[PDB]
Design a protein around this ligand. Sequence first.
Ligand SMILES: C[n+]1cn([C@@H]2O[C@H](COP(=O)(O)OP(=O)(O)OP(=O)(O)O)[C@@H](O)[C@H]2O)c2nc(N)[nH]c(=O)c21
Ligand SMILES: [Cl-]
Ligand SMILES: [Zn+2]
Ligand SMILES: [Zn+2]
Ligand SMILES: [Zn+2]
Ligand SMILES: [Zn+2]
Lengths: 38, 173
Amino acid sequence: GPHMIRYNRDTLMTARDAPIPDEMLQEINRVAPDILIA
Amino acid sequence: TRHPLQNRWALWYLKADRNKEWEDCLKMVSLFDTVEDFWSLYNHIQSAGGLNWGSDYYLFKEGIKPMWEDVNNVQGGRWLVVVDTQLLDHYWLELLMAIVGEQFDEYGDYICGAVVNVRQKGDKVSLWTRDATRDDVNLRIGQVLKQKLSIPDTEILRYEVHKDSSAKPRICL
Ligand SMILES: C[n+]1cn([C@@H]2O[C@H](COP(=O)(O)OP(=O)(O)OP(=O)(O)O)[C@@H](O)[C@H]2O)c2nc(N)[nH]c(=O)c21
Ligand SMILES: [Cl-]
Ligand SMILES: [Zn+2]
Ligand SMILES: [Zn+2]
Ligand SMILES: [Zn+2]
Ligand SMILES: [Zn+2]
């Protein structure tokens, strides 16, 4: 089988981007509306 | 563009409410399992430093509740980092990147999740691990933690056993 999938800090930071997926928006607004910034 | 993570992670949020038991303040917010969704979530929720006092974030592997009582945590413990706002945000985000990026070498299976507590007395960032009896594993995890978060050698981190928290550090680094 394949190796563990890893992302070092530089790779994650470069990948950092934009709207969020609507499903995610729905979930945050429904259970934790006060933390949402969107 | 899709970059899958090794694990699927759940963000939980605890909003203080003096008229609720602790567990009833805890809510699972969203799950994600790609880098893109990790950043979408992080970029569109309140930073740890921006949370009201008494509030928490938890980031735990799918299927693990962020509770001492969870079968995955009951024999476990946490590395604890005490703070005293940019420093707190930095500790939290560096820790999140280290865990979702699987940066704990061969000990990733022992990672349960991370916790940030926002408190007037002093904010806390913790890394929960599976087995408090494995000093070798937890020491290595602690060393990566201090390195990734740029914690000074003079700040002595404590590894605390959950069973004790539920009722003195087992390890110090
Ligand atoms: C992580 N956790 C916290 N609690 C409750 O929350 C308290 C710890 O609360 P806390 O872990 O959020 O830290 P805090 O800085 O607020 O604690 P303090 O320094 O003692 O003031 C415990 O006394 C429990 O009542 C918990 N209660 C249960 N049953 N299970 C848990 O996993 C759990
Ligand atoms: Cl950071
Ligand atoms: Zn390879
Ligand atoms: Zn190999
Ligand atoms: Zn998925
Ligand atoms: Zn940082």
